[PDB]
Amino acid sequence: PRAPRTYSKTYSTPKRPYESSRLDAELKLAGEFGLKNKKEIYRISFQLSKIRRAARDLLTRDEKDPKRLFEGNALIRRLVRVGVLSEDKKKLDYVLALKVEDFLERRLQTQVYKLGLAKSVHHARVLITQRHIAVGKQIVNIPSFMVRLDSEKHIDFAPTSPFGGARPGRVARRNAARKAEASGE
């Protein structure tokens, strides 16, 4: 048969299901960032834990070690490119001190709201899901996109999806066709 297909889980559930403080913090994050459920928070914390483990294993190595240098520089480059890690924190010790909100901020659902394209995080969510937002010349209909700190200056409405283009929509068409008859002629 053909080679196995690799696949991995992208989240991890909490050890304690019913910790009230964790539940309140998770609900705060979901309300602030307009998240669908706790699985998005779980995914972000899982990614943060993977990054933290990598940075820890690198930090246990001696300084100026070839592997530590290469992999830590690559991880710092990726994090600053995605904009999760600030430009003044390229040390690999502030990587460990990263938080869930740092990743949640670089979300396309967060960035569309922070760029004024939407009135709320939920408005940004529905606008993205409805193909109304284009990152470059490409429609991105997924709230989790991790804008790369250079597409941020390019997040605009799509040529389709009639908030940044020519067409007047689909419900406006039927509304006009009904208003023309309701006018009398």
Binding site: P1, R2, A3, R5, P66, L69, F70
Partner: protein
Amino acid sequence: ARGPKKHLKRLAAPHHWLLDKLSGCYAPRPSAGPHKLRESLPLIVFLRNRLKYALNGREVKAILMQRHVKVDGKVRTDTTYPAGFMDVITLDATNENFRLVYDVKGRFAVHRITDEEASYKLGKVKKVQLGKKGVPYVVTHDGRTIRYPDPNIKVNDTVKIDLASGKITDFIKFDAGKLVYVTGGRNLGRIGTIVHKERHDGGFDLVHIKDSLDNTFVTRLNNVFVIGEQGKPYISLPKGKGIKLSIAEERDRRRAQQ
């Protein structure tokens, strides 16, 4: 198990072919031939994955059927002909010649050469034996036998092969200070000079190689290929000349084009 295997499942093919994981269940099994199964490079791989001229194995067969491809002077219409080290692939249509050599990463690099030097090839002398009727001969790395060799040619030497008359024109000996290619192991694809040869009678002979960057590595005698003297290779070396830059320096060279 009851006879020789004729299939080659994917993920069992040599990794230096850089085959797709999910293209199919099977990989092109190198037919019997001059070099090896592992150390070879099927013409279908060289034509559909390294040159991108053909898109399918059917197109590879179509290319091969019209005598277009030529390996070491002969047509070699075999779809999975085991082309290997120092073999010369020449196509009369799209007339350029490649000498199959190892890049720094140990893959068979696409190395265009000229017609004026595609005529010859190099070959490591695998053995020196007396054949029938007392006629001495040499067996080379590519399974070639050459009768009446120079009486000074020993094992681990290299012989230039005309590849038109199929005869020895020149020979390089194995000695300290000679340019050598690494044809296997971790250092596969590196190029350097012989520093010393530790004997290890009974076991495996070890040879120390020093590249032009003064990096010194030891490797088994089985996978070293003399290619000349330092600064004068008898063949055209690939783009990297077997330097084995570290990963950091490779990243720097990659980022030096912005």
